[PDB]
Amino acid sequence: THATSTETIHYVNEDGDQVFEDGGGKLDFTRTVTIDDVTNEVVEYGEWTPVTDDEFAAVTSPDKDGYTPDTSEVAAQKPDMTDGPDGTVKDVEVTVTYTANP
C-alpha cells in the first residue's frame, strides 16, 4: 500500500536547472479495511484519515539574490486520494521558477 504522500517542490531556473534543494515534506494517512472473518473477503474500505493533518502546510520559497521566484510561497496543498481495493494516497508535485532580474 502507499499511504504516505510526499510533496516535492522543484525549485528551478528558466532553463529548468535545480537552483535549490527540493522543498516539501511528507503526510501520512491510514484507512481501515473490514473483512469477513470466515471467507477473508473484503466487505468495505474505510475513508482515508490523516495521521496529522489532511493538508500539506504552505511552503516559503528560499531567497536567491538577483532572482525572483514566481511565488514566494506555495500554498497549502491537499494530496489526491483514491478509494477501493487499489486506493492510494497520491504524491504532490509543484514547480517554482526563479527568473533572473531585471
Add this chain to the structure above:
Amino acid sequence: ATSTETIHYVNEDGDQVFEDGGGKLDFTRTVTIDDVTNEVVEYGEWTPVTDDEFAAVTSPDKDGYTPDTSEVAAQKPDMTDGPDGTVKDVEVTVTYTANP
C-alpha cells in the same frame, strides 16, 4: 463460526438408541483492520447466516420407552468475542426409560 448441536439419545444403561439428533448453524463476524499497520482495530459481533438459535427437536418415538422429554427446546449457542472469539457447540442428552 459454525455451531453444531448434538443430541445424544440414550437408554438407562448409557447405550445410544437412535442416531444423534441436532443440526448445524453458521455465523459470521467482520474484522476491521488498519490497512497500513495491519493491526486489528475491532471485531464485529457474531451474526447468523440463518437463525441465531437451533430449532426445537422432536424426540423419536421408541416402542416400550419414554424419553424424559418429547422435544428438546430451541437452543441458542453460546458465543464469545475478541481475537479468539468463537461460536460454541451445543451438547444435549435425552434419556429413554423403559416403561414398566
